[PDB]
Write a protein that binds this ligand. Structure first.
Ligand SMILES: CCCCCCCCCCCCCCCCCC(=O)OC[C@H](COP(=O)([O-])OCC[N+](C)(C)C)OC(=O)CCCCCCCCCCCCCCCCC
Ligand SMILES: CCCCCCCCCCCCCCCCCC(=O)OC[C@H](COP(=O)([O-])OCC[N+](C)(C)C)OC(=O)CCCCCCCCCCCCCCCCC
Ligand SMILES: */C(=S)=N/C1=[C]C(S([O])(=O)=O)=C(/[C]=[C]/C2=C(S([O])(=O)=O)[C]=C(N=C=S)[C]=[C]2)[C]=[C]1
Ligand SMILES: */C(=S)=N\C1=[C]C(S([O])(=O)=O)=C(/[C]=[C]/C2=C(S([O])(=O)=O)[C]=C(N=C=S)[C]=[C]2)[C]=[C]1
Ligand SMILES: *[C@@H]1O[C@H](CO)[C@@H](O[C@@H]2O[C@H](CO)[C@@H](O)[C@H](O)[C@H]2NC(C)=O)[C@H](O)[C@H]1NC(C)=O
Ligand SMILES: *[C@@H]1O[C@H](CO)[C@@H](O[C@@H]2O[C@H](CO)[C@@H](O)[C@H](O)[C@H]2NC(C)=O)[C@H](O)[C@H]1NC(C)=O
Ligand SMILES: CC(C)CCC[C@@H](C)[C@H]1CC[C@H]2[C@@H]3CC=C4C[C@@H](O)CC[C@]4(C)[C@H]3CC[C@]12C
Ligand SMILES: CC(C)CCC[C@@H](C)[C@H]1CC[C@H]2[C@@H]3CC=C4C[C@@H](O)CC[C@]4(C)[C@H]3CC[C@]12C
Ligand SMILES: CC(C)CCC[C@@H](C)[C@H]1CC[C@H]2[C@@H]3CC=C4C[C@@H](O)CC[C@]4(C)[C@H]3CC[C@]12C
Ligand SMILES: CC(C)CCC[C@@H](C)[C@H]1CC[C@H]2[C@@H]3CC=C4C[C@@H](O)CC[C@]4(C)[C@H]3CC[C@]12C
Ligand SMILES: CC(C)CCC[C@@H](C)[C@H]1CC[C@H]2[C@@H]3CC=C4C[C@@H](O)CC[C@]4(C)[C@H]3CC[C@]12C
Ligand SMILES: CC(C)CCC[C@@H](C)[C@H]1CC[C@H]2[C@@H]3CC=C4C[C@@H](O)CC[C@]4(C)[C@H]3CC[C@]12C
Ligand SMILES: CC(C)CCC[C@@H](C)[C@H]1CC[C@H]2[C@@H]3CC=C4C[C@@H](O)CC[C@]4(C)[C@H]3CC[C@]12C
Ligand SMILES: CC(C)CCC[C@@H](C)[C@H]1CC[C@H]2[C@@H]3CC=C4C[C@@H](O)CC[C@]4(C)[C@H]3CC[C@]12C
Lengths: 516, 516
C-alpha cells in the first residue's frame, strides 16, 4: 500500500502512482470549490511569480539574456499547468530554485571558457535528464527516498527555511545599500532603467511596507485562530489573511505619490530576452557555430548533477508535504512527480527555457494554505489540482496584467516571504527541539522524545543536527555550493551508521520517528 | 476599617489615613530593595519627564514663558519628592495634565482681556485652593468618593487611556506634517532653534523608532509571561522590559548619524523661562502693576474649578490604583493625598510654578510596573516610597543630565506611551465588555456579569457607557473642555437614578461590582 515499496515490474511505481491518485480526479476539481482555495491561489501566485521575476532577472544578468524573465515565466506557467493536471501531488509548486541558478551561472562560465554555445549545451543536458529519469522511474529508483528519514528531511526543510528568511532580509538590506539614509541627495536621478543614485525615504518606506505586510499577515493568522467575530466571517477573513495584508499595504503605497519604491517589473510581451542570440526553438547541432560531439556526450555529467539537484529538492519536498502528521488522504506518487518535473525540464531545455523543481518553501506554503485547522490539530487538507493550475496560468498571464503588477511594491512581497519563511518552520521537530534548548526542563511538552529520553541526550541529538545545518550553511556560501545536495545525502549515513554508536536504539526511534 | 467612612471628628479622615500607612513606613524603604523597583524607576522617569517637557513647552508657548519647562520640571520634582515621603499612596505619580493646561491657557486669555497680571493671579487661586482643601479635609469631603462606582471609574479610566493613545498618534502624525514624504527637499535647513523646513527620512525613521520601541516592549512583556530561559533571568529581563526596549532603540538611532530625529530638549540651567517677566518668588500684591482686590476675591471661582479638576483626576486615580482586585495591602488614604497634592499646588503657585494632580495613566503605569504576577493572577504589589522619590529626584536632576537626554529621540518615547496606553486598559471591565461585543455569545468568560445576565442586556449596559465615552470625547474637544469633570460627575446620577429604571437590581450588582 505504501508508495516507496519496490514492486519488481519495470515502471511498476509509475503505474501504481497513476492507479492510486487518478481515481480521485473528479474530487481534485470539486474539492477546489471553497474560498480557502481562491485565497491560496492569490497568495501562492505572488510566492510563485516574484522568484520567477528575480531569478529571471539574475539569469538575464548571469547569461547575457540567453535565458531571462520571459523564458522562466513561460516555463513556470507551462510546466505548472501540465504538472497540476497530470501530477501525482498537485500541492507541489514547480519552479526555479537557487541551486538551479548556481548551475546555470556555473555551466555558462564553463561554456564561455571552452568556447562552446551555452543555450544549445543545455538542450543536450535536457536529453540526458529525459534519458536518466525514464531509466530511474523504469527501475523505481525513487524507492531510495524511503531511506531519507525525518532526520535528513528536517535538516533540509529547516536549512531551506532559514536561507529563505536570510535572503529576504539580504534583499531589504540591499535597498538600504542602494538608497542609504544620507543628509543630502541629488534631486536629479534618472529613473528610466533604474534609480541612478540614492533617493530619500525609499529604504525606510521599504522597511515599513515589509514590516507592515508581515505584521498584518501574522495578525490575520492570529485572528483566524482567535475566538472573535462570527465563525463563518472569521474563516473568510482569516483564509484571505495574506491577500488582505497585500491589498491594504499595496493601497498604502499607492496613496503615497511622491516617494519611490521598487515595483514588480515584467517583460513588454512574449519574446525571447535576446532575439540576436536565439529564437523560441534551440537547435541541438548549433545556432552560429558547430556544437562539438565531445560535449554532446560529456553533458551527461552536468545532467547527472542537475538530476541529483532536482531529485533531492523535489523528492524531499514530496516527503515533507505528503507526511503522515498532515492529513493527505488522496495519496502521493514519488515516481510520476519525478517523471514529469525532470521530464518537462528536458523538453523545456529544447525551447531555451529553464528546467524547474518542486521547491520546498512554495510547496509547503501552498500545502499549508489549503490545510483547514480544527479546535490545535489538522482536520483535513483541501487536496485538489485547481490551486496549482490557476497559479501556473496567472504566472503565464503575468505579462498581460503588467498594469496590475506595476503598482505592487517588492517591499510588500518581502513581508509575505518573511511570513512564508516563519510559517514553514511550524511542522518541524528540529525547530521544536531547538526551542527546548532555551525552555527549562520542567516546561517541555508531553511528547515521545521528552518522557522516555534524557534532556541532555535530546539536546546532544539537537546539537548534532545544528552542526549539520552549520556545515551545510558554509557549503552553500562557498564555491562548492552545487556539492550541498551530496553533503545533505551524507546526513543519511550519519543517522544510519554514526548516531547508533553514541545513542541507543530506543532513543533514535523516539527522536527520529516516521509517524508521531 | 474602610477609608471612605465619615468619622465625625474634624480632620478624622486625615489622621485615620496617617495612623493606617505610617506604621508600614520602614516597609516602604525595605520593599524597594528589588530589581523590579529599579526597572520601574527608569520606566516611570521617562513617562514622568516627557510630559513635563511637552506641557512645559506648550505652557511656554501659551503664556509668553511666564510659566514653562524649567518651572514645571522643578514643581514636578519638589512635589514628587514631598508626596513620595509624606503621601498615603506613594504609587500615585504627581504631575501636570491636559485639563490643568486647558485652565492655564483659559486663565491667561482672561488675565490678558481684563488687563490684570497672570502669574500673580495664579498665587491668589493657590491661596483659595489651600483654603478649600483644608476645609474639605476638615469635614472629610473625600467621603463623597465612595459614591463614585466602577461605572464612573472605568468610563474615566478608559476615556483617559484612549485620549493618551490618540494624542500619542497625533504627535507621530504631526512629524509627517512637519517632515512630509516629498520627491525633493532643501539641502539647506537651519537646525539651531528647530528644523526650518521638511527633511528626508525623519518622518519614516520616527515611525520605525516608535513602532520598534512599542514592538520590543510588548515582546519582552510576552517573554516575561512565557516559559523560556531560567526563571531568575526571565523576570530580570522581563521586569527591565521597557528600559531594554528604550536602550536598544536609542542605540539604533545613535548609530544612524546622517538622519535627523527630534530629541528630548531641557533648559540650560535652573532659571525662570522669562527673567524680564518674573523672579523665583511671585508677589501677591503685584509685580509691575497693582493687582486689583476684585480678582483677589473672584479668584475663588477659578480655584473652585481647579479644585474639582485636581480632586476628580486624583481621587478617581486613587480609586483605580487602590482597588480590591489589585493586591494593595498597605492601604490608601484619600484625605492625606488630597491635602498634599492640592496643598503643595497652592504653595507651588507662590513660586510661579504649576500646581499638579495624581495623573491616571502615569499612576496606573507606575502601579502596574511594581505588580509581581503569578502562574494568570496578581500575587502582591511592591508598595514602597523609593520608586516615586527617585523618579521625582531624576526629573529634578534632568537639567544636569542634558548630555544623556539629548541623545534620546521622542519617537522612541512615543513607542513607550503607546505601550503605557494599551497596558492601562488591562484591569478595566468596560474594555473587557467592549471585546465581548465582537466575540460570539458561546466564547464569553465564566464571570458574574455573563452567567446570570442576558447577553443583549450586557451589551446595552456596555452601549450606554460608550455613549457616555462619546459625549465625554466631544466635550474634551469643544471649547467646554473644562466642563468635562462635571459631565463625568453626571455619570454618577446615570448609574444611581436612570440605569435602575431600564435594568434590574441583580443585573447592576453583577455588572457594576465594587469587588470581583
Ligand atoms: C507589535 C506591533 C508592532 C508594530 C508593527 C507595525 C509595522 C509598521 C507598519 C506601519 C503602518 C504603515 C504606515 C505607512 C506610513 C504612512 C505614510 C503616509 O503617507 O502617512 C502620512 C500621514 C499624514 O501625513 P501627511 O503627509 O499626509 O500630511 C500632509 C502633509 N502636509 C502638511 C505637508 C501637506 O501620517 C500617518 O498616516 C501617520 C503615520 C502612519 C500610521 C501609523 C501606524 C501605526 C504604527 C505605530 C506602531 C504600531 C501601532 C499598534 C496599535 C495597535 C496595538 C497593537
Ligand atoms: C509582529 C511583527 C512585527 C515586527 C515589526 C516591528 C516594528 C518595526 C521595527 C523595525 C526595526 C527597525 C530597526 C532598523 C532601523 C533602521 C536601520 C538603519 O537605517 O540602518 C542602516 C542599515 C543598513 O546598513 P548601512 O546603511 O550602514 O549600509 C551601508 C550603506 N552604504 C553602502 C551606502 C555605505 O539597515 C539595516 O541594518 C537593515 C534594516 C534592518 C531591519 C530589521 C528587520 C526588521 C524587518 C521588518 C519587521 C519584521 C521582523 C520580524 C522578525 C522576527 C519574527 C517575529
Ligand atoms: C530572493 S527571491 N532571493 C533569493 C532567494 C533564494 S531561495 O529562495 O532559493 O533560497 C536564493 C538561493 C539561495 C540558496 C542557495 S545559494 O544560491 O546561496 O547557493 C543554495 C541552496 N542550497 C540548497 S538545496 C539553497 C538556497 C537566492 C536569492
Ligand atoms: C504629549 S505628551 N502631549 C499631550 C498629552 C496629552 S495626555 O494628557 O493624554 O497625556 C494630551 C491630552 C490632554 C487631555 C485633555 S485636552 O487638553 O486635550 O482637552 C482632556 C482630558 N480629559 C479629561 S479629565 C485629558 C487629557 C494632549 C497632549
Ligand atoms: C545577446 O547575446 C550576444 C551574445 O552574448 C551579446 O552580443 C555580444 O556582446 C558581447 C559584450 O558586449 C560582445 O562579445 C559583443 O558585443 C557581442 N558578441 C557576441 C558574442 O555576440 C549581447 O550582449 C546579448 N544581448 C543581451 C540582450 O544580453
Ligand atoms: C517675557 O514677558 C513679557 C511680557 O509678556 C514679553 O514682553 C512683551 O511682549 C509682549 C508681546 O509682544 C508685548 O507686551 C511687548 O512686546 C512686551 N512688553 C511687555 C513686558 O509686556 C516677552 O515677550 C516675554 N518673553 C518671553 C521669554 O516669552
Ligand atoms: C493585486 C493586489 C492589490 C492584491 C489583490 C487581492 C484581492 C484580489 C483580494 C483581497 C481581498 C479579497 C476578497 C476578500 C473576501 C472575499 C469574500 C469571499 O466570500 C469571496 C472572495 C472575496 C470577495 C475576496 C476576493 C479577492 C480579494 C479582493
Ligand atoms: C518525455 C518523458 C517525460 C516521457 C517519455 C515516454 C516514456 C518514457 C514513458 C511515458 C509513460 C510510460 C508508460 C506508462 C505506463 C505503462 C504501462 C505498463 O504496464 C508498461 C509500461 C508503460 C507502457 C510505460 C512505458 C514508458 C512510458 C511510455
Ligand atoms: C491555459 C491557458 C489559459 C494558457 C495559459 C498560458 C499562456 C498565457 C502562455 C503560456 C506560454 C505562452 C506562449 C509562449 C510563446 C509564444 C510564441 C510567440 O511568438 C507568440 C506568443 C506565444 C504563443 C505565447 C502566448 C501566451 C502563452 C500561450
Ligand atoms: C561546534 C559549534 C561551533 C557549532 C554551533 C552550534 C552550537 C550552538 C551547538 C553545538 C553543540 C551544542 C551542545 C551539545 C551538547 C549540549 C549538552 C546539553 O546538556 C546542553 C546543550 C549543549 C551544551 C549543546 C548546546 C548547543 C551547541 C553548543
Ligand atoms: C538612557 C537610555 C539609554 C536608557 C537607559 C536604560 C539603562 C539604564 C538600563 C537598560 C538595561 C538595564 C540593566 C538590565 C539588567 C540588569 C540586571 C539587574 O540585576 C541589575 C540592573 C541591570 C544591570 C540593569 C541596569 C539599568 C539598565 C542598564
Ligand atoms: C499643605 C497645607 C494645606 C498644610 C496646612 C493646613 C493645616 C490647616 C493642617 C496641616 C496639618 C493639620 C493638622 C494635622 C494633625 C492634627 C491632629 C489632630 O488630632 C487634630 C487636627 C490636626 C491639628 C490638624 C489640623 C489641620 C492642620 C494644621
Ligand atoms: C532630593 C535632592 C536630590 C534634590 C533634588 C532636586 C534638585 C535637583 C532641584 C529641585 C529644585 C531645584 C532648585 C530650584 C531653584 C533654584 C534657585 C536658583 O537661583 C538656583 C538653583 C536652585 C536652588 C535649584 C537647584 C536644584 C534643585 C534643588
Ligand atoms: C458613539 C456611538 C457608538 C454610541 C452608541 C453605542 C453603540 C456601540 C451601542 C449602543 C447600543 C448597543 C447595542 C445594544 C444591544 C445589542 C443587542 C445584542 O444582542 C448585540 C449588540 C447590540 C446590538 C448593541 C451593540 C452596540 C450598541 C449599538
Amino acid at each position: 500500500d505504501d508508495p516507496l515499496q519496490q514492486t519488481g515490474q519495470l515502471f511498476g511505481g509509475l503505474v501504481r502512482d497513476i492507479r492510486r491518485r487518478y481515481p480521485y480526479y473528479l474530487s481534485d476539481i470539486t474539492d477546489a470549490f471553497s474560498p480557502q482555495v481562491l485565497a491560496a491561489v492569490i497568495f501562492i501566485y505572488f510566492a510563485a511569480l516574484s522568484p520567477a521575476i528575480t531569478f529571471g532577472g539574475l539569469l538575464g544578468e548571469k547569461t547575457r539574456n540567453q535565458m531571462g524573465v520571459s523564458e522562466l515565466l513561460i516555463s513556470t506557467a507551462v510546466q505548472g499547468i501540465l504538472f497540476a493536471l497530470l501530477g501525482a501531488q498537485p500541492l507541489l509548486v514547480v519552479g526555479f530554485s537557487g541551486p538551479l541558478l548556481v548551475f546555470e551561472e556555473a555551466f555558462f562560465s564553463f561554456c564561455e571558457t571552452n568556447g562552446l554555445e551555452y543555450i544549445v549545451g543545455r538542450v543536450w543536458i535536457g536529453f540526458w535528464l529525459i534519458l536518466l529519469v525514464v531509466l530511474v522511474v523504469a527501475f523505481e529508483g525513487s524507492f531510495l527516498v524511503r531511506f531519507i528519514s525525518r532526520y535528513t528531511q528536517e535538516i533540509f526543510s529547516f536549512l531551506i527555511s532559514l536561507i529563505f528568511i536570510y535572503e529576504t532580509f539580504s534583499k531589504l538590506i540591499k535597498i538600504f545599500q542602494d538608497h542609504p539614509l544620507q543628509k543630502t541627495y541629488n534631486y536629479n536621478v534618472l529613473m528610466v532603467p533604474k534609480p541612478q543614485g540614492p533617493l530619500p525615504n525609499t529604504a525606510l518606506l521599504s522597511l515599513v511596507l515589509m514590516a507592515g505586510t508581515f505584521f498584518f499577515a501574522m495578525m490575520l493568522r492570529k485572528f483566524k485562530n482567535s475566538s472573535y467575530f462570527p465563525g463563518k466571517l472569521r474563516r473568510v477573513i482569516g483564509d484571505f489573511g495574506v491577500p488582505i495584508s497585500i491589498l491594504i499595504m499595496v493601497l498604502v503605497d499607492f496613496f503615497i505619490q511622491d516617494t519611490y519604491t521598487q515595483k514588480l517589473s515584467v517583460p513588454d510581451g512574449f519574446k525571447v530576452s535576446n532575439s540576436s542570440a536565439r529564437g523560441w526553438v534551440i537547435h541541438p547541432l548549433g545556432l552560429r557555430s558547430e556544437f562539438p560531439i565531445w560535449m554532446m556526450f560529456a553533458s551527461a555529467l552536468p545532467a547527472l548533477l542537475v538530476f541529483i539537484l532536482i531529485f533531492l529538492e523535489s523528492q524531499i519536498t514530496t516527503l515533507i508535504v505528503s507526511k503522515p502528521e498532515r492529513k493527505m488522504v488522496k495519496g502521493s506518487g514519488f515516481h510520476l512527480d519525478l517523471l514529469l518535473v525532470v521530464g518537462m525540464g528536458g523538453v523545456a531545455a529544447l525551447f531555451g527555457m529553464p528546467w524547474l523543481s518542486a521547491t520546498t518553501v512554495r510547496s509547503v506554503t501552498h500545502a499549508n494554505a489549503l490545510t483547514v485547522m480544527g479546535k490545535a490539530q489538522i482536520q483535513e487538507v483541501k487536496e485538489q489540482r485547481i490551486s496549482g493550475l490557476l497559479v501556473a496560468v496567472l504566472v503565464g498571464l503575468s505579462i498581460l496584467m503588467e498594469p496590475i503588477l506595476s503598482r505592487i511594491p517588492l517591499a510588500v512581497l518581502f513581508g509575505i516571504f518573511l511570513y512564508m519563511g516563519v510559517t514553514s518552520l511550524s511542522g518541524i521537530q528540529l525547530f521544536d527541539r531547538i526551542l527546548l534548548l532555551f525552555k527549562p526542563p520542567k516546561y517541555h511538552p508531553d511528547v515521545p522524545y521528552v518522557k522516555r529520553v534524557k534532556t541532555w541526550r535530546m539536546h546532544l541529538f539537537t546539537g548534532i543536527q545544528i552542526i549539520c545545518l552549520a556545515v551545510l550553511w558554509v557549503v552553500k556560501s562557498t564555491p562548492a555550493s552545487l556539492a550541498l545536495p551530496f553533503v545533505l545525502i551524507l546526513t543519511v549515513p550519519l543517522r544510519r551508521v554514526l548516531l547508533p554508536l553514541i545513542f541507543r536504539n530506543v532513543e533514535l526511534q523516539c527522536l527520529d520517528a516516521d509517524d508521531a
